[PDB]
Write a protein that binds this ligand. Sequence first.
Ligand SMILES: [Cu+2]
Ligand SMILES: [Cu+2]
Ligand SMILES: [Cu+2]
Ligand SMILES: [Cu+2]
Ligand SMILES: [Cu+2]
Ligand SMILES: [Cu+2]
Ligand SMILES: [Cu+2]
Ligand SMILES: [Cu+2]
Ligand SMILES: [Cu+2]
Ligand SMILES: [Cu+2]
Lengths: 269, 270, 270
Amino acid sequence: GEVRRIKLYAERLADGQMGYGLEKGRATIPGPLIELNEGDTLHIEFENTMDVRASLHVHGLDYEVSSDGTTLNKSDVEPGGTRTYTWRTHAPGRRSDGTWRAGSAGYWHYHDHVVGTEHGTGGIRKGLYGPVIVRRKGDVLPDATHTIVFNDMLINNRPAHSGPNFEATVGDRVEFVMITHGEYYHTFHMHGHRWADNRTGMLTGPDDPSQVVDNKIVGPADSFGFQVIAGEGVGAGAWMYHCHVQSHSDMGVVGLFLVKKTDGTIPGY
Amino acid sequence: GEVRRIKLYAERLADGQMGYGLEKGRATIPGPLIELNEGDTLHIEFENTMDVRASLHVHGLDYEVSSDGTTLNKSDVEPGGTRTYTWRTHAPGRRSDGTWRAGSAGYWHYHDHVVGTEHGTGGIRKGLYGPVIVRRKGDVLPDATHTIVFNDMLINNRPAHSGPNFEATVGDRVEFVMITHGEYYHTFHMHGHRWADNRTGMLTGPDDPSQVVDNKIVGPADSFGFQVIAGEGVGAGAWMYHCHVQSHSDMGVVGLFLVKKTDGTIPGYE
Amino acid sequence: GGEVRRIKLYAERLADGQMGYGLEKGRATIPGPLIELNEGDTLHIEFENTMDVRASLHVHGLDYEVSSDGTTLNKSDVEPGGTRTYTWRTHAPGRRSDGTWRAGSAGYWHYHDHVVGTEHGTGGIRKGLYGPVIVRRKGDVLPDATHTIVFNDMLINNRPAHSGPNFEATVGDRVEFVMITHGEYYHTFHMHGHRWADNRTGMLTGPDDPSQVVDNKIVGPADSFGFQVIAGEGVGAGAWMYHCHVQSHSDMGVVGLFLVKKTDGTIPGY
Ligand SMILES: [Cu+2]
Ligand SMILES: [Cu+2]
Ligand SMILES: [Cu+2]
Ligand SMILES: [Cu+2]
Ligand SMILES: [Cu+2]
Ligand SMILES: [Cu+2]
Ligand SMILES: [Cu+2]
Ligand SMILES: [Cu+2]
Ligand SMILES: [Cu+2]
Ligand SMILES: [Cu+2]
């Protein structure tokens, strides 16, 4: 694949949060989406603009201990400090012994591993997480990608009973990245939409046995994703997504997948 | 792909519980099993006979906003009032864009969405849940079908140390639907039997790499099913099924898959 | 495969209020010894309960009659100082007379006591009466070494917290992990620098295998999965943290090291 270079900033935010950003003062929670094709290399010029030690750890991708982002492998960043982390990816292939080497492709995530504790409980709690997508050659690309993060009892570190809305048009091919962090198990559910419990979130073809689901138990540091055709077989509407743990939904871990008709209207909303 | 109509009533029961039934005063917990072939449409003539608002939301199957069963999409039911709910299904096909549309086939469930709160915490707690099986052309059909719901710390809203038993004979193709509800994660286990972590609960053949398990972690609104040849390779016996979370089995989330010999006997148990 | 095997196995109290399975009197370990079988194999376990309380042997996944359930229910537990021969059987997958595919015994399985403390072995599990079982399919690739990580309540292999076990391998070694969970709590098992397949073997079969590829897996009491990695594949030598990813679990010390060595013997940054 291609070699690529980006800048990443860890920053303090209002209400004592902590974001990553591609640009200083544009830090988000979750952090910016990172999109890669199998075989790509990413060199990340990472600057800690905070008064506390921070790091960048990644799930699933290839990295050397020198890019672990852990005090253990001395890969964290002093306050004000800079470090360039290297993530590599590979494509699948038979090894020489006959066995199949799984590719790097999947729905993954990066997070701090040193804020609060040597496991980044503080960083994670404050908002130092975001999505990685590693694509395979042939994978179908979406019209948009939306990142939903169950962080303890919040979605994307928002004040509860205010979970984020996502706008789309019927027939649009919408991608969701679903990441979980903190202490608690959850179940992610979506009204009017289904996906496949497999790498991609859609069945490869008729030979794919993967269960089809609208509900998934997820624990801290689990990542999955899936694409749907917005409105497929159900029409336009305010389509609720929510944590299906009853106390979680009642305390307001809910948002709307707002699927507009072609004309721009929405039924009874 | 045939169109169908059935009547469903929400009723308050004895001991302050709530349940769906196919007739008046015949409501069960779980609710009655709904079985569909892909393509089939089901129109549900639903009546809320209770003194509180109630609804019917479904997982997995195709419905419009007007069958969401939510406060949001004004698709819940006043006390005593009626509403006709529509669930469509679809077979798997090729989309124009060359991708594979998945198909509605799978182990699913229906549950109230307004009784307790705007997510029916109260309805679910009181027993407003039931199983839906959507079948695909060629799916092997069972000799019998037994629904097991881990709702909070009970099975099928029974008293504890009292979880249901299911009788069967050696060789029976027995189907289980396993639904989870409320606040707590669980692990469903079964002695003497195992299944595949996939759609049908059966391996398609030797090119099915899916994990063969007898123990599966589940949380609120998770649905799976499977089919076993009763007592396959293990013989007749009282075959325990139990939540494997230790305090959960200890407090009485246990039941018996009672697998009789052909002559109707069973080896001695307690 | 297709061989009859015989072993002896003891239950024993240990130091610090613990109980262990062992191949010999006084050599009990926590976890108990790894039992490795090929599909078709029958294992006869000459079990002796050296302890002062009723203990059993119950196994997940494998084939056993109720006379080897090791339950109160089926009266197959063992009196203090008693001996009982448990029989585990295993079958290869095969086409059934109903045209369906019979799932094989092969996978990542476990054995635990069912009668110490409660009729669900709560006390026996807590105190260390658990061990791993692997059943191999014909032509399964065999590892260079096998390592067992049990998440029992808040600990690993009933060790004192902040001191989880380390495993040593050289870059290029085929390293197998058995990953069992017991007790009351859900966990997520994670490993730095390595990935596996959510499927029977923890390895994709080929390009036809849609299994999700994961470094993080939610597990609950009595969940068992396993996988094999090439040590340092595409990441190189190093101290490769494995940890529960439940933040307070990792904080309270549920961590260990996959110590992957360069070929010369060294570890960068040690
Ligand atoms: Cu880590
Ligand atoms: Cu939640
Ligand atoms: Cu992590
Ligand atoms: Cu629901
Ligand atoms: Cu809902
Ligand atoms: Cu339970
Ligand atoms: Cu009796
Ligand atoms: Cu049991
Ligand atoms: Cu844990
Ligand atoms: Cu067990």
